[PDB]
Paper text:
Encapsulation is mediated by specific cargo protein motifs known as targeting peptides (TPs), though the structural basis for encapsulation of the largest encapsulin cargo class, dye-decolorizing peroxidases (DyPs), is currently unknown. In this study, we report the structural and functional analysis of a [name] encapsulin system from a Gram-negative pathogen – [name] (Kp). DyPs are ubiquitous, often homohexameric, heme-containing enzymes, named for their ability to oxidize and degrade a wide range of synthetic dyes – with concomitant reduction of hydrogen peroxide to water.
Based on gel densitometry analysis, on average 12 copies of KpDyP are present per 60mer KpEnc shell, suggestive of encapsulation of two KpDyP hexamers per KpEnc. To investigate the structure and cargo-loading mechanism of the [name]-loaded encapsulin, single particle cryo-EM analysis was carried out on purified KpDyP_Enc. The encapsulin shell was determined to 2.5 Å via icosahedral (I) refinement. The asymmetric unit contains one individual protomer that exhibits the HK97 phage-like fold consisting of the canonical axial domain (A-domain), peripheral domain (P-Domain), and extended loop (E-loop). No open pore was observed at the two-fold axis of symmetry. Due to its size, the large five-fold pore represents the likely access point for small molecule [name] substrates to enter the interior of the compartment, as suggested previously.
Numbering used by the authors:
A (entry chain A), B (entry chain A), C (entry chain A): 1 to 267
């Protein structure tokens, strides 16, 4: 028995299995940063901080004794609660195949968006700098028309090459940029084909962010330390409802600031 | 001996084999919904209903006894009769290779169209909601010109992604939409190539429906329960004719309403 | 873990065992229809309907396509709640042998009476016709005095024989009829001996119904389809009480209406 008091929830095994399957599907659909950043294996519930290797000079304890304090980044925990009606839970065992998991899907969307925004744009309260605001390269603005995308991608790739970064290059685009680049052109220009000739993979769809980002996936530039992966826990239940939550525990660090170019949304 | 009183029909074995081959060919050509929906193995002649897992509160039998009634969807049977002239049947054994099976082909077309319309647009009398009218996403209107098809397909794909549905994405188009998208453009735009870059398969041709539909084929969203597959039975014969019928037995349910976007015919 | 959230109940194993033993004893004492009707093995929580084999003509889907809908009888669920004081539950482990299970016995009586009344007199809301109202034979009125019982039993047996039904013949009597026929006569007439010479078993005592019924137990005339047998589930608990319920899931059909004669209470 762990802190996720699952056995105390009035939820049958079949309902638990269906809920877990739905949560996994929605999370894989909505999670974007994990596709481009180095994600470690879960460290456990006792994982609290990651040391940065740097020190801070302190006032000495006394006679000719010098003191330095080690620096570390703390781990932040995200929790999003949702409520189920207990009727879907009871119907799963009766044989229902269309039980309503909309609150679970909304909670998954919220937690995935929070994680993606923390990784990309940063979360000041948790001490997470963010991939984009912590970039030493000059940001590039995306064009209104999809025809100008190859030029901007080429300039960003040139920025990476001049900075000296190697390895495969991947771009993550927001919802608007992704739909604009996938809709196509009215002049018959194979802009998608040119983009795929330039890039080293598939465009990553990120509903949580705006604009985009081009980054190298050689490894060792963006570290996501995971203590607890996204899991489902139980809070309380009523005669007609059950309250659950989605919880994750992680920290993120940007080690190389030259391996990333941030693309700003079109104006 | 079963309810299809085949042995009572004045039809030779060679004629039966040719008729079955023609019916199978025409049915595979005309059946479209089975390519995109989950089709189960036949359940048998005694398959009458499929339970939905839900209940309805009833007035109690008496002193402090509560009652709920289980809900199920009944199975509907489709039968289409046709007439053969007995001259083709007699000529098959004499060696004919061009016997007239036009009534059989027309009956196959009718029954396939009825099944496809029930699955896609719904059949109220049998309790079948239908794929398109039971969609929670906003329907999209197809453009008059094939050049605008990639944009509409991209918007529908974005709707699926925002709803959180995963898996391969397939589009089914009516006859007009299919012929318009396959005829091409007068500006040399590779619209078919762009469409095939966006989609996860081949466009499904559906002569029975108008407009189109984009849906995910991950599995578990559209259930077709089959009790009796399409089979040939005998009714009566005259000195110069034999009356047969094509019969099927099925029910259909749409379990996930967010995994489908309906495309409306161009105006 | 199933829909009967037993493990969430603050009830020890010894208390659970005693409660189950008491419930089984009281249910075997009070259940009467199961002694004379064909009872199937439990079908499971997903059992929702039983097909009758009949069809209903529908309005056609379109051009020369005929449609029929299969007919089925839904399964009804009965639930009766009761409350225990938690003091008996705590005392069972302390060694109590006279714990108060009166609410459980009352709930068992209520649910058994509801089931028996649904089987014999019918339950319109659940679609259960009932054994007695769905009888094609002419009902017979019981006499006020036990001396006239053999004559009525003989007439009912003659009705069965003329209808052509075979097999053992059993009579189920209400509480008043049973006590009247067992009290005896003041003239020394062995009416019970004559009744047992006529009948093919022991008189079934039915506290839930009035009058009586004479029916053949050859098999295949009265079908009780059981999805979930009577079981104990947990709802909620207080600091001084625990709320449980008795739940069953079944449907009943009378297939042969000539194998039953209904005896009406004496006037």
């Amino acid at each position: 028995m762990n802190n996720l008091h699952r056995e105390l929830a009035p939820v049958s095994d079949a309902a638990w299995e269906q809920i877990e399957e739905e949560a996994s599907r929605t999370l894989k659909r909505f999670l974007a940063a994990r596709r481009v950043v180095d994600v470690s294996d879960p460290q456990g519930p006792a994982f609290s901080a990651v040391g940065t290797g740097h020190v801070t000079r302190l006032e000495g304890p006394g006679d000719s004794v010098g003191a330095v304090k080690r620096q570390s980044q703390p781990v932040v925990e995200f929790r999003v609660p949702f409520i189920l009606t207990r009727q879907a839970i009871d119907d799963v065992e009766r044989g229902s195949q269309d039980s309503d998991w909309s609150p679970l899907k909304e909670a998954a969307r919220k937690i995935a968006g929070a994680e993606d925004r923390a990784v990309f744009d940063g979360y000041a309260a948790a001490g997470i700098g963010g991939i984009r605001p912590q970039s030493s390269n000059s940001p590039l603005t995306l064009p209104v028309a999809a025809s100008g995308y190859p030029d901007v991608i080429a300039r960003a790739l040139d920025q990476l090459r001049v900075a000296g970064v190697n390895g495969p290059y991947h771009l993550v685009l927001g919802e608007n940029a992704y739909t604009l680049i996938t809709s196509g052109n009215e002049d018959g220009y194979p802009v998608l084909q040119h983009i795929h000739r330039l890039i080293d993979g598939e465009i990553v769809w990120a509903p949580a962010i705006e604009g985009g980002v081009l980054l190298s996936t050689r490894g060792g530039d963006f570290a996501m330390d995971i203590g607890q992966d996204i899991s489902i826990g139980y809070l309380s239940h009523t005669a007609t409802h059950v309250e659950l939550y989605l919880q994750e525990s992680f920290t993120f660090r940007t080690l190389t600031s030259e391996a990333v170019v941030s693309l700003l949304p079109s104006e």
